[PDB]
Symmetry: D2
Subunit: 115 residues, 4 copies
């Protein structure tokens, strides 16, 4: 509902399918506590991670398991994983889409935040 992750593949020009994605919430002691996870679908999307009630303000980290993705395709990649670390803010719009565009030695990420 309030958080969606979309992952695309810049080598093949396709969604990045069956990519593991883990979301963590920063705890008061500065550790990363598991929050939600899943695998991207055939459309490269991961829906249903959280609910509005659970997704309170705070710092979150989205870890995308890019290394496993590339290796399953027979490609040696540079990065251990990709990270997206951000603050959820109630003063801004209410739906967050985190998009990532993957290449073996590079990635790009953006946020699309809408009401």
């Amino acid at each position: 509902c309030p958080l969606m992750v979309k992952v695309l593949d810049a080598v093949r020009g396709s969604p990045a399918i069956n990519v593991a994605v883990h979301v963590f919430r920063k705890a008061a002691d500065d550790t990363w506590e598991p929050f939600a996870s899943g695998k991207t679908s055939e459309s490269g999307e991961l829906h249903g991670l959280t609910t509005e009630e659970e997704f309170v303000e705070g710092i979150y980290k989205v870890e995308i398991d890019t290394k496993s993705y590339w290796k399953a395709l027979g490609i040696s990649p540079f990065h251990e994983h990709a990270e997206v670390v951000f603050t959820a803010n109630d003063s801004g719009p209410r739906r967050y889409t985190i998009a990532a565009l993957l290449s073996p030695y590079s990635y790009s990420t953006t946020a699309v935040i809408t009401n």
Copy 2:
């Protein structure tokens, strides 16, 4: 149907709404002939540009009017427009999404081609 364009704004973290997009097809004499056009919606998307019957193999150019977009927001941008020039190939998958991510001095574009 076979072609969708999606435009995002990296400054505001939002769809790029009401952006003019023009599609051209390369003619036999190497000129660019108008093919389809429209304005992105509230979701940053432009649907309905063409049909499967009309969208034959060939070289196409998608011109995104980024300059007008930025100026309507009060921002001075670098580029006159953004371009995406590609060949449509029937041997590949059947739906083309062209995505563009805009900043004042930079843009990024990818193709997502699915069946």
Copy 3:
């Protein structure tokens, strides 16, 4: 340099070497006139395209021949080329670096502009 182009390869984690680049300038009749061309070096850089005298005000198109680059590597890419179209030197002379980052189905570009 008044105009420098740098190209990187996101698949190999390297400079993109031997990339052909053609620069055009819009003429008074609205056509695109050939302005300069060259190839990226071993470092992915292309220097020496123009001079401060020659690089007058105008609308310039930097065409990076990405398909020719990928095809020369035996890869079938999506785009024909990567374009950067911009007005230059309209507030006096500036130095422009146009950078591009290439993948078979995607590219990114940015500009770095300095005032000498």
Copy 4:
């Protein structure tokens, strides 16, 4: 340089100057140990982080402090930082350039790796 970081600003069309960068290396106990840090120069570059002796095999995290950069410019950005996490020098010593291109709600990074 064994490790160099270059940061560009997509809103201003310039180097991103005075960007803080912290590098960590994963320790035997799986924690992230501080390895080196520094700030980008006027050219957007950060040199001198490490040496070929010190830059051994390992898993490194280059943390680019993008929020601190944007906030120092008076802009409220989305991300806390931009991370690049990679295994280095596992096939012998290499020279790594980590480049990043910043906007308030987006970033891109790439690696350029050469063999001396």
